[PDB]
Each structure stands twice: as C-alpha cells, then as structure tokens.
Amino acid sequence: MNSFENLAQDVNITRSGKTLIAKGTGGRSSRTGYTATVFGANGFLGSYLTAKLAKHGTTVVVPYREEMAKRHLKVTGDLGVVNFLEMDLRNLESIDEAVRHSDIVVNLIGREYETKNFNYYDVHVEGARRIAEAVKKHNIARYIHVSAFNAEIDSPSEFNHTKGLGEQVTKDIVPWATIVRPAPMFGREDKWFLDRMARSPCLVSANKFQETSNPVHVIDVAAALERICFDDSTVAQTFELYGPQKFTQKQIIDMVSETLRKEVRHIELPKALYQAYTKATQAIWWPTYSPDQVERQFLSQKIDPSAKTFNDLDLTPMELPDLMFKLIRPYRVNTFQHDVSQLENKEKTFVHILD
Amino acid sequence: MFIGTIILVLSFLGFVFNRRNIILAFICLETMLLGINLILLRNSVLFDDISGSLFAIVIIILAGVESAIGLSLLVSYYRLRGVINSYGI
Amino acid sequence: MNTFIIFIILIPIVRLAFNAAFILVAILFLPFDLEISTLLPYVMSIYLVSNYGFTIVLLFLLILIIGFVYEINTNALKINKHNKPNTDSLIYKL
Amino acid sequence: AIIATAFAETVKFSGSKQELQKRTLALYRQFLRGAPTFADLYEVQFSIPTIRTKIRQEFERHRFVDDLSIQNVLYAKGHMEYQECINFWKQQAQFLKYFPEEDDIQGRHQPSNFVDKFLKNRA
Amino acid sequence: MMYLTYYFIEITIFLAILCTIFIISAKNPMVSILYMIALFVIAAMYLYLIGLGIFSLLYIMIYIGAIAVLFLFIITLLDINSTELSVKSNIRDLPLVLISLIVLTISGLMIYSNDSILINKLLEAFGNDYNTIITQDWFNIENTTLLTTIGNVLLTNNAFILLVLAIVLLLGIIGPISITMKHKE
Amino acid sequence: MIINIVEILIFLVCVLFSVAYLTVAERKTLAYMQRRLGPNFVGYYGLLQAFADAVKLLLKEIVLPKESNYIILVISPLITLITALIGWVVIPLGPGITLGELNLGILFSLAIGSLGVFGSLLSGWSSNSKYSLLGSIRSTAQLISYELILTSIFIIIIMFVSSLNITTIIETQRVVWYCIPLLPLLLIFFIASVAETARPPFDLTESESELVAGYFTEYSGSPFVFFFLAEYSNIILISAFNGYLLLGGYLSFNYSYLFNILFNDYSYVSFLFEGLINSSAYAIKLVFLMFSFIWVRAAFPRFTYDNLINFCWIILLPLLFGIFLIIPSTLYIFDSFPTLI
Ligand SMILES: NC(=O)C1=CN([C@@H]2O[C@H](COP(=O)(O)OP(=O)(O)OC[C@H]3O[C@@H](n4cnc5c(N)ncnc54)[C@H](OP(=O)(O)O)[C@@H]3O)[C@@H](O)[C@H]2O)C=CC1
C-alpha cells in the first residue's frame, strides 16, 4: 500500500483551530485535510512543490495569470484537489479569495528582472505586503516566504535589496512567518544555470567565472518546503538551503563541458559593456539578462550561520557532479562509437550488399 | 588560367596529403578536371576556337563515366569488407 | 541591372543493408544523362548537318540501345526475393 | 512456419536440478553481459554495477527454492524478461519498476517502529 | 558604377581558394561535397563572366545534377569512416606542402610561354596589364552559337570521337553491372 | 530601374498568390469529387484558408530534435524554394513578355530542375537515424530516373524547332500545337511531371514514411511553409513546361480580324487587351492541368518502388529511344529539317 510519507500522524490540528483527519493510504484518492495556496506554482520551483503536495491529496489553490502555462498542474492530483483562480497583485479581493480557506500559504513570487508594470520593488516588497496583510486578516496559521539567497537590505544588487525588504516586512506583519533562503537551484528546465550552459551559444562574465556559491537540486528544496509546511516547529524561523559543496562558476562550466563532450563557449568581456548590452536587450519582449544580474556576478554567496539548514529537517542534499549526467545527457551529442578497429574481420562475415 | 591552375594544384595537394578518407580523393579528381576545363575554355575564348570547347565537352562526358566506374568499384570493395576505413584503399 | 539580374539575387536573400538495384539506378543515370545531353548539339545543328550527321547520330543511338538491351535482359534493376515459395514436389519414400 | 523471435528459448522442463543449475547460470551470465545494453537502450540515471546488484538480488530472492517444477517456472519467466529487455520492447517505466531504490527518498517519515505506525494507523 | 563589376573574376578566384581549403578541412565528407558544389557553381559563374553561359548550364545540369547527386547517393549508403583534420597527423606535410605549392604554381605558370629565359617566362604570365579591343564586323550572317558549332564539328568533322564516346558510355553501363550484379543465374 | 522593380513585384505577387490559392483549389476540387465541400468556413467561401495555415505555422515553435542537424533542416527547404522559384523567370506570358528573355531558356529550366533534387537528398541527412537515409534514396531514385524522361521530350520537340528560346518555341506553335503530332508524349510528359513532384500515384516515400517513425519530412514551423510553397509551385512550373512545349503556351484563336475590326490603331489599350488574351490562354491551360493533377490524385491508387522503377526503365525509355529514331527519320523523309531561326 501507499504511505503518507509527508505526515507523521493522521490527526493534525492547525494553529487556527481546524481539525484535519487524514483519509486513505496516501495515493491519488487520499486526502490530507490540508488546504494550501501557492502563488507561483506556474514556475520552476512551485511546479515541483504542487506535485509533492497534491500527490498525497492536499488541496492546492493555484493562482494564475496565463491560462495555458498552468495546465500541466491539473495532472498532479485527483479531481477537486487542484483548484485554480485568476489573480493579480493589483486586485486585492483575488488574494483574499485565494488565501481564505487555506491552512498554509506559500509565496514563491519574484522575477529575476524588471518590467513595465512591475519593478523589483513592486513585486518583491509590495506584493509581499499585500499577501501578508491578507494572511494576517484571515489569520492563516502558516506562512512560508521564499526570499533569495545572499539577501541583504542594502546591497549593490537591487534584487537582493528588495528580497531583504520583503523579508523584514513579511516578518514585521506576520511574526509567525517562516522564511526560506534557497541558493541557486538547478535541475531539468532550469532558468539560468544548466539549460543555459548547455544551450547558450556563448557565456559572459563581467567578473571572471569566479562568483562562488553553493547550488542545490530543486527537488530537494521542494522536499524542504514540504517538510516545513507540515512541521509547526518552524514558525518564526529562517533557513539557508545551500548545499554541501562550494562551486565557482568556472568549476561548474568545466563539469558541464566534460559531461557534454562539447566545448562550452565563454568570453569574459568586462562589466560596463555587458551591462550596456543587457540594458538594451530589456526592450525586446522576451526575458533576457538584465542590468542588475551582471551586478550579482560579483556577489558570492555569504551564508548566514544563525539559520537552520537541511540537517534540521532530516535531509541529505544532493551533489552537482553526480546529477549533471542525468541533467545533461539529453544535450550529449554522442558523436559515434570509439575505436572501430578490430571490427573489420567481424564485419567481413556478414552480407552487406544484397542482390 | 589562374583559377584553373589553382584549383588543380590545391586539389592535387589535397589528393596527395589526405590521411583521412577517400571521398576527398574522388572530389579532388573531379576538381582537377574542372580546373583543366576552365584553363582550356579561357584559351578557346582568347583564340576564338572550337577545339577547346570540344575537348571540354569530351572531358565532361569522360569524367562522369569515370565517377560511375569509380563508384561501382567502391561498392565492390564495400561488398566484401563492409566498412571503408580511413586508411584503406 | 536587369530584371533577371535583380531577381536571381533577391529570391535567395529574402549497420544496414541495401539491394544493388538501389545503387545501379543512380550509377546508370549518369551515362543515359550524358547521352541525352550530348544529343543537344544535334538538335541545334540539325540543319547544317543535313543527312550526314543524321546518320551519325542514328549509329550513336543504336550503339547506346545495345547497352540498354544488355541492361534489360540481365534484369539488373529487378529486386530479387530470398524467401522463395516452395515449388518442389511432396514425395514420400515407401 | 511462425518462426521464433530473436532470443527465444523453447520451453523445456528439465527433469533434474543439475541441468537447471547450468541453465540458470547461463541466464545470469547473459543478464550481466547485457546490462550495459540495458543502460543504453533505456535512458538510465545510475550505474551498471547497480543494475548488476539488482540482478544479483533478484536471483538471491529465489535461491532457497528446492521444488524442481517451481524452479523451471522461475527460469522460464526469467528468460521471458531477458527477451523483453534486450529486445527493446519494454520502455523506461516497465524497467525502472525494478529500481524503486534509485528514485529520491519518498518523504521523511517512513515508519519502522510501532508507535509511528499507530500514529499513522498502519499497525 | 562602371568599376563595380571589374574584379568579379578575382572574387571568384578568392572564393575557389576558400572552397578548396574547406573541402580539405571539413569534418564530415558530406560537407566536403557541398563545398564541391559551391566550387562548380563558382566555375559556372566564371564561365559566364568570360562569355560561355552554355557551359555554365551544362555544368550545373551534369556535374551538380548527376555526379554530386551520386556522390551523396553513395556517402548516404556507405560507412565511410574518417579522421578529422589534426595537428599530430598532418602537420608533417607542411614543408613538403609548401615546396610543392610554390614549385607547382610557378611551373604551371611558366609552362604556358615560349621565352627562353626562365624568370621572364613567369614575368610574362604576370603581365596581365593590357586591355583587348573588341571590334564589330558584319560577316556573320546566321544565328550560330557555340552549341550549334559543337554539333556541327562533332557530328561532321569529328564523328569518330562521337562514335567512340558511345562505347565509353557502353562501358559505363556494362562495367558497373558486371561488378555489382552477380549473375549467379 | 523602377519599372523593373514593379515588374518583379507583380510577378512574385501573382505567382505566390496563385500558389496559395492552388492549395485551396486542390482541397475544394478534391472535395467536390468526393461529394463533400470545403474549406468554406474560414473565409467568404474559404478564400482565406491558406493564409490561416500559414500564420498558424509561423507562430508555431521552431523545435529541433536532439540528434538532428539545425542548419541542414533549415537551409535545405529554403534552397528548395529558391531553386523552384527561379524557374519562373524564363516563363513567358506574351511574346517577349518575360523577365529573363534569355536565349537559353530551355536549358535554364532543365538545369534548375536538376538542382531540385537536393531537397530530398539533404532531408535524409537531417536524421542521423538509419532508415531515413534509405527512404530518401528511394525518393531520389524516382526523380533522377524520371528526369531522363522529361528531358528526352524536351529534346524530341526541339528537333522540330532548333532553338532553346522559349518564345521562339511557342511562336512555332502558331501553325499547330506540338500536342497534335506528339499526343502520346503529352501523356508521358504529364505522367513524369506527376512523378517528379512525388505526387500521387507516385507518393511512395511520404506514405511509406508516414507509417514509420521517420524517413519523411518531419519539419515544423517556417520550413513546413516553404516546403508547401515549393511543392505547389514546382507543380505550376512543371505544368508550364507542358504548356509552352505542347499546348501552345499563350496562343489562342487568331485575334487578327477582331483587333482589326475594333481598334484602328496600336494604342496602349490594344497592347493591354492583347496581353490579357495571351495570358488568359496560358492561364486556363495551367488551370486545366492543375485540375488534372488533382483529378489524378482523386482516382488512382499508389505505386510501389519496384513497379515504378520498372515502369520507367523498361517501358518508357524504350519508347523514347525509339521515338528518337522515328522523328529524325520523319524529317529526313520529307526534307523538312528546321533551321536555326
Ligand atoms: N530559481 C532559482 O535559482 C532561485 C530562485 N529564488 C526565488 O525562488 C522563487 C522561484 O521562482 P523560480 O523558481 O525562479 O521560477 P520563477 O521565478 O519563474 O517563478 C516565478 C513565479 O512568480 C510569478 N510571478 C512573478 N512575477 C509576478 C507578478 N508580478 N505578479 C504575479 N505573479 C508573478 C510567476 O507567475 P507566471 O509564471 O504566471 O508569470 C511565476 O509563477 C522566486 O521567488 C525567486 O526569487 C531564489 C534564489 C534562486
């Protein structure tokens, strides 16, 4: 039979005064009782999260803006489990609707770039404040913000500045808020890491490929958010999900090139020129690197040692050099067989040309 | 007179210094014949003569038949061996 | 700048086995193509070569028809099947 | 006549344990020699040694079976699976049915003592 | 405007050089055949430049249309292994490549002249300096072109070569059959 | 060189729009032969279906398989379109109303119909998988085997008129169209035309590969669109070769007595009404033969590669190398060898 691998018990009780009795063995038909809300399930991390939540029958409310990106989530659970709402941070009633009946809330909002309708401030600060005020009004028992690694309130990067302001506002309205701080995530169809090193015609670094970091598999961060949504010990806490092994950019690129058996192209042209070329590419409608991210190329990962980690959740986070084979074998060209010699004499026995 | 001599020389050199395969040898033969025909047709124009163009059309015929026979011979080699390796004839 | 000259630039810029009939068809396309292309000068000089070059091209075509005859009666282009239907007779020793 | 496929063995029930010993050993040998093919044909995310480990486990499963007819049945079923795998009939899912372990740890609480099973109503 | 079309022949010379180097350096031979097609096209261009478009078209419909179709028709069906251009394997030929290049070029250029002193035989080849006047006469009455002339001489004055090319083509039929087709029955 | 630009754009617009609506004409003609209708819902009687199939395919992803080439699958359809289009230059719609107006127009078309094969040749190399490289070989052997038969007809009729100028070949057909003395060549030329375009009943590879996982033209996006503007244009082009070789091209009823009766002078109206009449004869002929491509498609079943190569090299070629002997003899019997003009 199947199992409720996520739950430690069957009768759980939220901090809002709801009783949640589990039903079943933990398969597609089961129900965990819980009702959550994930504000970015359409994206890279939230997709894996809703998959792990709805595999066990947890009701999942998924706010969307594009109707067509989401459809790949309805597969993740039985009927009635995954529920969709059209929402926008510029409409408040939509946010109250999404969070009303929820025991858990999960904020994954945030672009790696600015737009015409949303600057970094409006999406990482004001959006967090709107959600927090609604999480507070309705007194939702749990709130699980995700704010980027290296976040610091004042910093050369505006992204990390906002991400730090989003932290303090959430925690200054919702005191029981949990905050996670993942490091650069990697996996299949990642944004800016392996699909780029494997597809992009040429890389560039305003520094050298020297920015140091601890990357991590995204499935494990999704496992972490699962092991935090249900553990009530994690209120008014902070996490640093970074990973065992420290990797410079050039190290990752060399492993990528080795596994791919193709020579990745890197250039290493200076800062102001790349910063200008990025600025001019922000006028075309599709996402591209933005002036504030080449700024983060000079900002290596400072880890906060006062915050919890994977080992506080009984997790064993994975290593990049093992997983790169699984993640890059599709782009492996595999030109041909090695050393065809000592095969002429064997081929000579077969009929190659029929008449 | 220039272009033909150049294609001819470079193709002879790539025929002689080919340590790789054989299709380059076939190609270099065809390019040598091309360069010959260009030399000859340039001279036939400058002299306003026809014997050059006659020998040119004859070269085209003979070169096509050459490639036909060569590519049957290769097919015989392949019949027996199954692989045309880089350094076999 | 002619309209042909304007057009002829604008348009572009805006493991296994085989049967030997598969290969013979290409290898034989060469000489028959060279025959039909060598026939062009005749059709464009047919008057000036009146009744002499006529007979010459006929002996040309007849010589080429000989090779076509050899090709047909060999049955080169035919595909040959190996898993034959049995046509022996059923005979029982008594 | 409807002829047999590639790696087909005719079903033949041996009358002795001493012959089936040999046939089983040949099957094990073929599985091991063919494991790299089982890694290439199926897009596998782990080692050839781990495949050989699982094969050894599957053969240790029925190591202590002394009834001859049941052994003949087991050998025939194993040759069926070798024919299914080496010819590219199985797809990835039906093959990785044999490798649950390699997939990521399913959650946190995997009960092993009584009290946890009781809290999860599995006792 | 005038001199925009002055150096087209030099351009074709440079391009033929490029395509030869590319035929020699390419990894997969299929690409080398494509570059051979580029070379036959450049030759057809040059022949149009010097006033023989008929041969340009005969080339495009013979070489490219048949021979190169066949070359791809072969390399598509055969397992022609290779050895990508390298430095450990082919560098050793550089001194001999260079000596052979210089000598063969200078000889192929000196050969075409009848002067007795050697250096002047090459300095005559490098004398491409003067323009050729073209006068207009009125003696040609018909619409005879190069193809008509070729038909006239090939079918009257040189009939024997035609009636021998028929036998060359009979070889082109009959040899490949004998080689490929096993007359076991 | 302004009007040269005007004349190019007119021609390109007319040809491409004719191709787009040949798709719709194929579908509606084939439908009414099948006792159904339509496309008749995407426009005012379906006159916008082709542009809808296009615009859908241009907003579609450009997806390239893992083990494939990119450049070959991209340029090869593009070069196919180009080569198929430049054959339109030598095609006359009036006496000298031609963009090219070359004296070697037949040989230009014949060399470009030889360049056409490379699309099918490079398709199989877009798939490093092994079976596609044999399926392309089947589809190349049909084309190079049938181009011998189309050419041979070009030469047979040029025995009647000793000039490679297309306009001159058409002007000799004032006396009689060359489809009357050489009627069987009309069937042969139309059969071989249908073959060279790989059209039914000669659609062996597209069907044989539609069953298999590959060996077909598994493209997507824009390359689809170019391949379907290069098939439906090679069709008109090969139909045009039939037109100006055998069916009189632009010729029609002598419009001498009419124009004499109605005009009195050579104005810029008579030139227009003349060019209208000529092009209309040329157009209705292309229409009847495009109808015939469709008519044939609706009826006949498919061939197999053995039946097809056997049809060519054992039935058609012997008849033609026979006709190569009967026609020069027929001219020599009667002292009627044509002159060079
Ligand atoms: N992936 C990584 O490497 C790292 C991620 N993070 C953080 O973790 C989170 C992961 O997001 P990621 O996994 O990167 O994939 P995305 O960043 O693409 O997830 C973005 C989500 O936010 C939603 N969203 C963005 N802007 C708005 C907006 N203005 N209004 C409403 N919804 C919006 C998107 O909705 P739609 O898709 O419908 O537009 C999408 O669902 C982000 O908060 C990011 O800052 C931190 C460090 C590294």
Side-chain angles (χ1 to χ4, degrees), chain A residues 347-348 350-355, chain B residues 74-76 78-83 85 87:
Chain A
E347 292 280 57
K348 275 174 195 185
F350 303 95
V351 165
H352 317 97
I353 300 185
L354 278 299
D355 272 314
Chain B
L74 197 56
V75 165
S76 190
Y78 183 82
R79 280 195 89 115
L80 280 176
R81 292 161 180 76
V83 59
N85 70 341
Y87 60 83

Short mmCIF file of all heavy atoms in Angstrom, two decimals, chain A residues 341 343-344 347-348 350-355, chain B residues 74-76 78-83 85 87, unseen atoms left out:
data_model
loop_
_atom_site.label_atom_id
_atom_site.label_comp_id
_atom_site.label_asym_id
_atom_site.label_seq_id
_atom_site.Cartn_x
_atom_site.Cartn_y
_atom_site.Cartn_z
N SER A 341 38.54 -0.19 -34.93
CA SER A 341 39.49 -1.23 -35.28
C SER A 341 39.17 -2.51 -34.52
O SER A 341 38.48 -2.50 -33.50
CB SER A 341 40.92 -0.77 -34.99
N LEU A 343 37.26 -4.70 -35.86
CA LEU A 343 35.90 -4.97 -36.29
C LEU A 343 35.81 -5.25 -37.77
O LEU A 343 34.75 -5.68 -38.23
CB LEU A 343 34.97 -3.80 -35.94
N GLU A 344 36.87 -5.01 -38.54
CA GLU A 344 36.84 -5.36 -39.95
C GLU A 344 36.67 -6.86 -40.13
O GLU A 344 35.86 -7.31 -40.95
CB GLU A 344 38.12 -4.88 -40.64
N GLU A 347 33.10 -7.76 -39.34
CA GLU A 347 32.16 -7.28 -40.35
C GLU A 347 32.29 -8.06 -41.65
O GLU A 347 31.31 -8.18 -42.39
CB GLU A 347 32.41 -5.80 -40.61
CG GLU A 347 32.04 -4.89 -39.45
CD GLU A 347 30.56 -4.60 -39.36
OE1 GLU A 347 29.76 -5.55 -39.26
OE2 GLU A 347 30.19 -3.40 -39.38
N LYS A 348 33.46 -8.61 -41.92
CA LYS A 348 33.70 -9.33 -43.16
C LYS A 348 32.83 -10.57 -43.31
O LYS A 348 32.67 -11.05 -44.44
CB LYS A 348 35.18 -9.69 -43.26
CG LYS A 348 36.05 -8.57 -43.84
CD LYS A 348 37.53 -8.88 -43.81
CE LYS A 348 38.39 -7.64 -44.05
NZ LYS A 348 39.85 -7.97 -44.12
N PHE A 350 29.54 -10.82 -42.55
CA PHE A 350 28.15 -10.50 -42.82
C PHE A 350 27.98 -10.06 -44.27
O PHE A 350 28.91 -9.59 -44.91
CB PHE A 350 27.67 -9.41 -41.87
CG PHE A 350 27.80 -9.76 -40.43
CD1 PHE A 350 28.90 -9.37 -39.72
CD2 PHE A 350 26.82 -10.46 -39.79
CE1 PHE A 350 29.02 -9.69 -38.39
CE2 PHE A 350 26.94 -10.79 -38.45
CZ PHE A 350 28.03 -10.41 -37.76
N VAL A 351 26.76 -10.23 -44.78
CA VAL A 351 26.40 -9.81 -46.13
C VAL A 351 25.96 -8.36 -46.04
O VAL A 351 24.95 -8.05 -45.40
CB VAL A 351 25.29 -10.69 -46.70
CG1 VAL A 351 24.68 -10.10 -47.88
CG2 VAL A 351 25.84 -12.04 -47.08
N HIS A 352 26.71 -7.47 -46.68
CA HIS A 352 26.42 -6.05 -46.67
C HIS A 352 25.65 -5.57 -47.88
O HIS A 352 25.03 -4.50 -47.81
CB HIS A 352 27.71 -5.26 -46.59
CG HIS A 352 28.68 -5.81 -45.61
ND1 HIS A 352 29.71 -6.64 -46.00
CD2 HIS A 352 28.80 -5.67 -44.27
CE1 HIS A 352 30.41 -6.98 -44.93
NE2 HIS A 352 29.87 -6.41 -43.87
N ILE A 353 25.66 -6.30 -48.99
CA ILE A 353 25.03 -5.87 -50.23
C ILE A 353 24.29 -7.07 -50.78
O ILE A 353 24.90 -8.04 -51.22
CB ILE A 353 26.04 -5.33 -51.24
CG1 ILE A 353 26.74 -4.12 -50.62
CG2 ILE A 353 25.38 -4.95 -52.57
CD1 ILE A 353 27.71 -3.30 -51.48
N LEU A 354 22.97 -6.98 -50.76
CA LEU A 354 22.10 -7.97 -51.35
C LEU A 354 21.93 -7.70 -52.84
O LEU A 354 22.13 -6.58 -53.33
CB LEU A 354 20.74 -7.95 -50.66
CG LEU A 354 20.53 -8.68 -49.35
CD1 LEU A 354 20.79 -10.16 -49.53
CD2 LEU A 354 21.39 -8.08 -48.31
N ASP A 355 21.57 -8.75 -53.56
CA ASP A 355 21.30 -8.66 -54.99
C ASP A 355 19.92 -9.22 -55.31
O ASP A 355 18.99 -8.46 -55.60
CB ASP A 355 22.39 -9.41 -55.79
CG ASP A 355 23.58 -8.53 -56.13
OD1 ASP A 355 23.39 -7.38 -56.57
OD2 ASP A 355 24.72 -9.00 -55.95
N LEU B 74 34.12 1.12 -55.75
CA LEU B 74 34.00 1.31 -54.32
C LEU B 74 32.92 0.42 -53.73
O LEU B 74 33.08 -0.13 -52.64
CB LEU B 74 33.65 2.76 -54.04
CG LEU B 74 33.81 3.41 -52.69
CD1 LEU B 74 35.18 3.31 -52.18
CD2 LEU B 74 33.45 4.84 -52.84
N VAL B 75 31.83 0.24 -54.46
CA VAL B 75 30.75 -0.59 -54.00
C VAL B 75 31.18 -2.05 -53.94
O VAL B 75 30.74 -2.80 -53.08
CB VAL B 75 29.53 -0.34 -54.89
CG1 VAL B 75 28.46 -1.37 -54.76
CG2 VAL B 75 28.92 0.98 -54.54
N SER B 76 32.09 -2.46 -54.83
CA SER B 76 32.63 -3.82 -54.76
C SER B 76 33.50 -4.02 -53.52
O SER B 76 33.38 -5.02 -52.79
CB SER B 76 33.45 -4.09 -56.00
OG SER B 76 33.80 -5.46 -56.09
N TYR B 78 33.27 -2.34 -50.79
CA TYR B 78 32.35 -2.36 -49.66
C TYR B 78 31.58 -3.67 -49.56
O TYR B 78 31.25 -4.10 -48.45
CB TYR B 78 31.41 -1.19 -49.77
CG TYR B 78 30.45 -1.06 -48.63
CD1 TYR B 78 30.82 -0.46 -47.46
CD2 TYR B 78 29.18 -1.54 -48.74
CE1 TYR B 78 29.96 -0.35 -46.43
CE2 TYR B 78 28.30 -1.44 -47.72
CZ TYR B 78 28.68 -0.85 -46.57
OH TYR B 78 27.76 -0.76 -45.56
N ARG B 79 31.22 -4.28 -50.69
CA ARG B 79 30.56 -5.58 -50.67
C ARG B 79 31.36 -6.53 -49.84
O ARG B 79 30.83 -7.23 -48.97
CB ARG B 79 30.44 -6.20 -52.05
CG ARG B 79 29.37 -5.75 -52.95
CD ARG B 79 29.22 -6.72 -54.10
NE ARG B 79 28.28 -7.78 -53.76
CZ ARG B 79 27.11 -7.99 -54.34
NH1 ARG B 79 26.65 -7.24 -55.33
NH2 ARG B 79 26.36 -9.00 -53.93
N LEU B 80 32.66 -6.56 -50.10
CA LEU B 80 33.46 -7.58 -49.45
C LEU B 80 33.81 -7.23 -48.01
O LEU B 80 33.91 -8.14 -47.18
CB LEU B 80 34.74 -7.83 -50.22
CG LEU B 80 34.63 -8.71 -51.43
CD1 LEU B 80 35.96 -8.70 -52.04
CD2 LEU B 80 34.20 -10.10 -51.08
N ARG B 81 33.97 -5.95 -47.69
CA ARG B 81 34.55 -5.58 -46.41
C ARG B 81 33.58 -5.00 -45.42
O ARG B 81 33.77 -5.18 -44.22
CB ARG B 81 35.69 -4.58 -46.63
CG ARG B 81 36.87 -5.19 -47.33
CD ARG B 81 37.71 -4.20 -47.89
NE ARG B 81 38.86 -4.77 -48.57
CZ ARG B 81 38.82 -5.35 -49.76
NH1 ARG B 81 37.69 -5.46 -50.44
NH2 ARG B 81 39.94 -5.81 -50.26
N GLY B 82 32.58 -4.28 -45.88
CA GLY B 82 31.52 -3.80 -45.01
C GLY B 82 31.78 -2.47 -44.37
O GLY B 82 30.86 -1.80 -43.91
N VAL B 83 33.05 -2.07 -44.35
CA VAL B 83 33.43 -0.76 -43.86
C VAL B 83 34.61 -0.26 -44.68
O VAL B 83 35.56 -1.01 -44.93
CB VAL B 83 33.79 -0.77 -42.37
CG1 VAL B 83 34.92 -1.72 -42.07
CG2 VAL B 83 34.12 0.61 -41.93
N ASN B 85 37.37 1.95 -44.20
CA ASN B 85 38.08 2.59 -43.12
C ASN B 85 39.00 3.67 -43.66
O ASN B 85 39.35 3.70 -44.84
CB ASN B 85 38.87 1.57 -42.30
CG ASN B 85 40.05 1.01 -43.05
OD1 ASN B 85 40.14 1.09 -44.27
ND2 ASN B 85 40.98 0.41 -42.30
N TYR B 87 42.03 4.54 -43.72
CA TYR B 87 43.35 4.32 -44.31
C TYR B 87 43.37 3.12 -45.26
O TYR B 87 44.45 2.69 -45.68
CB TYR B 87 44.39 4.16 -43.21
CG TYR B 87 44.12 3.00 -42.27
CD1 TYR B 87 44.51 1.71 -42.60
CD2 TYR B 87 43.48 3.19 -41.06
CE1 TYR B 87 44.26 0.67 -41.77
CE2 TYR B 87 43.23 2.14 -40.22
CZ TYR B 87 43.62 0.88 -40.58
OH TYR B 87 43.38 -0.17 -39.72
#
